[PDB]
Amino acid sequence: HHHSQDPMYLKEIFVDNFRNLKKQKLEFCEGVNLIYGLNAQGKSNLLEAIRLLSMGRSFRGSKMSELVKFDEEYFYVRGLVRSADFYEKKIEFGYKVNGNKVIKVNGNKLKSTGEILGHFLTVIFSPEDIEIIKEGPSRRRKYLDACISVIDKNYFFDLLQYNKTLSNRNSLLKKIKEEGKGEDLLEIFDEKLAEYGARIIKVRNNYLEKLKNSMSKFLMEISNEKLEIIYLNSAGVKEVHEENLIREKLKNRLTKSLTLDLKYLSTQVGPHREDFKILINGYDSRVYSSQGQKRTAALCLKLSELEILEEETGEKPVLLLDDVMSELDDNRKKYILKKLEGFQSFITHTSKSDVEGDCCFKIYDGIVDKLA
Amino acid sequence: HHSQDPMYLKEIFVDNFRNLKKQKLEFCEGVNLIYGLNAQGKSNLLEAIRLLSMGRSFRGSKMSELVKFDEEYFYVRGLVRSADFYEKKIEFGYKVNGNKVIKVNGNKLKSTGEILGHFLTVIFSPEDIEIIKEGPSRRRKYLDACISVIDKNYFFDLLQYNKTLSNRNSLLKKIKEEGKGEDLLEIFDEKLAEYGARIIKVRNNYLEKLKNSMSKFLMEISNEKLEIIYLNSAGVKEVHEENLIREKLKNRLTKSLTLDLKYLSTQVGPHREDFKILINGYDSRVYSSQGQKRTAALCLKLSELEILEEETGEKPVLLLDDVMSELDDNRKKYILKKLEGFQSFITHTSKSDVEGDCCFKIYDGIVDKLA
Ligand SMILES: Nc1ncnc2c1ncn2[C@@H]1O[C@H](COP(=O)(O)OP(=O)(O)OP(O)(O)=S)[C@@H](O)[C@H]1O
């Protein structure tokens, strides 16, 4: 329930010592904001600054200290956003090289970084999205956790507490190994991991269900191929619903894992070792397909992220398109650029001819010049 | 044993078996190469041979499917020698009206399972990677077949267990459609727990030996560490006292009644177990490369063979079903020497680029020594 259907909208952003960007305030437009310039001038840095306001981290996976302008002691980003319930919401993110970060919403300091989700909703499309198709469980897992956490605060809560308990269990393993004086205390942590692990598996399944439905729709439209998604959960359950059952299986598996865990000083059982497999027609897309369909599968995955996010939050997000509008024979552009219709979008490119923005910004040397 | 003579199939006689013509084949004690364009003929032969070990089709086919088209029966007769037998005759007769006749040295076996393992084979196939790739049931059935060949007590138990389970499951739907029958349930539960406990103890024993063999082969082939985790349905990982395993199984049977009534299935028991195959602490089903999966499949089978020899004192015949298709002829030569003092049957497409001691060409169901 919201007071309006005003889409998410970034009125302006202010960047101070952020990457190579000069200290500046940028005011944006409704519709397509074209950001163009030579390679390495600051295009992706600006998208990274905008995406920071949504996630509280670099979409590139960079450490915070890497976003600080070389030889400075802090960076600071401030966005003013409009959303369905807010004519204006101020979002501030300051980070100092000594580790101190200060995140504020409407002038109130957030107690943790995760509390920044999703005051400002974005979906970012990037060439590296094909890595979610190609790389290991870790990549897919990090992606899934972020998709869900953005729309579901209780899951994010669970994930945070799970990781905390996991960390405690792992250090306990060290303490048991470093002595003879502890295998025992593991039971109570085991019980907790199974409870939180089961809640997480349940929600991951709910999302993957929705993911498969939406992706099957998109895939069948542009490639006429058939999508399946297999969730390799840690409970070994091929069809997950009874949370009771999953809890017991996870707990049994933890107990049977004790010797192995003492050897590796880690926990092989749980959500943090899971994966999901993406199947095209019947084959594993990670291995059995070419680069045409991986790029296609990546697109469908992200199109689905967008669709699920809108439906679950009742908000319309801002779209970030990083270096994904090059190439593109133009019926393959005619499809996407019209799909951007009712959104505010930020599109990076090499030229301002190819794509027509409603507002256009040239960046050279970290300096952003509105209107070429 | 009175000796250490290897298992050796001197000859086989097939009558109305699949597409095979009626014929006697005589084999050598080394490499027997079977080749040809044919897909079925090459395999039908391996199926006849493997029948003499397992008393079933390794293709999962019903017996009636092994019978040639317009015929009323098939018949397979093998002559074998093993550590204690200069010659042992094994005959398998099946008529389409149903009656199986299995005989060893002229004596009829009262049950099909008694054929295990008068004649030991291990069969290698590209399909073996599915044991690494696929789900609990594929691993479970493989385990059951490996153990059953060695241990006929286990095979027995497994039959009584399976029979009891189906009865129990038929009863679950009576309890839910009518409103009674939990009295038989408690009786079935006691029976499932008893047999289940015996099954679990032996599986644990086997998987321990499997872990040791497999980890040795893997450490030598790839210098990676192998672990096996046996997820027994008693939820213990402390498996040698059948008494306590019974109690645990019985308890869990009780606690999952509601589940069982809903799905009309039985959630607790060895019929739902699994074991994890881990490389360097990570689940091979989830984290392992394609190469790693094939290597692990190899190690699994090398281990099956090592444990079978150690447990029985017999050296099995090796069946290599189309595993030479995609190899190098330096890797083809490698293996050939590793076969050493076994009898082996190898199916291929060509006659060269592998060495063998007896070559057979199968075309149109006739197996012809030498082309
Ligand atoms: N912390 C930092 N301080 C100063 N300069 C930085 C910092 N981090 C990166 N840079 C530089 O800033 C540039 C990065 O600009 P980007 O926006 O990534 O390039 P871009 O080509 O405009 O974006 P894409 O991905 O091609 S659309 C490079 O020249 C980096 O060396």
Residue numbers in the entry:
A (entry chain A): -6 to 365
B (entry chain B): -5 to 365
Original paper wording:
RecF is a multifunctional protein involved in recombinant DNA repair, homologous genetic recombination, and DNA replication. Similar to RecR and RecO, RecF is a recombination mediator protein (RMP) in the RecFOR pathway for ssDNA gap repair. RecF contains the conserved Walker A motif, Walker B motif and signature motif of ABC-ATPase that exhibits ATP-dependent dimerization; additionally, the signature motif residues interact with the ATP bound to the opposite molecule. To gain insight into the mechanism of ABC-ATPase RecF, we solved the crystal structures of TTERecF, TTERecF-ATP, and TTERecF-ATPɤS.
The structure of TTERecF-ATPɤS is also a dimer, that is completely different from the dimer of TTERecF-ATP and is thus another conformation of TTERecF. In the TTERecF-ATPɤS structure, domain I of the two monomers interacted, whereas their respective domain II structures were located far from each another. The dimer contact surface was 2613 Å2, which was 7.7% of the dimer total surface area (33774 Å2). The two monomers of TTERecF-ATPɤS were dissimilar; one monomer consisted of TTERecF-ATPɤS and the other consisted of TTERecF only. One monomer structure (ATPɤS binding) was nearly similar to one monomer of TTERecF-ATP dimer, including the active site conformation of the Walker A motif, Walker B motif, and signature motif. The Cα atoms of these two structures can be superimposed with an r.m.s.d of 0.807 Å. The other monomer structure (no ATPɤS binding) was similar to that of the free TTERecF; the r.m.s.d of the superimposed Cα atoms was 1.121 Å. According to the structure and interface of electrostatic potential, the interacting amino acids were mainly located in the RecF helix αF from the structure of TTERecF-ATPɤS. Thus, we were sure that the RecF helix αF is the interface of the RecF-ATPrS dimer. In addition, the DNA binding affinities of the TTERecF-ATPɤS dimer for 21-mer ssDNA and dsDNA were 466 nM and 381 nM, which did not significantly differ from those of the native TTERecF. The structural and biochemical data showed that the TTERecF-ATPɤS dimer cannot stably bind with DNA.
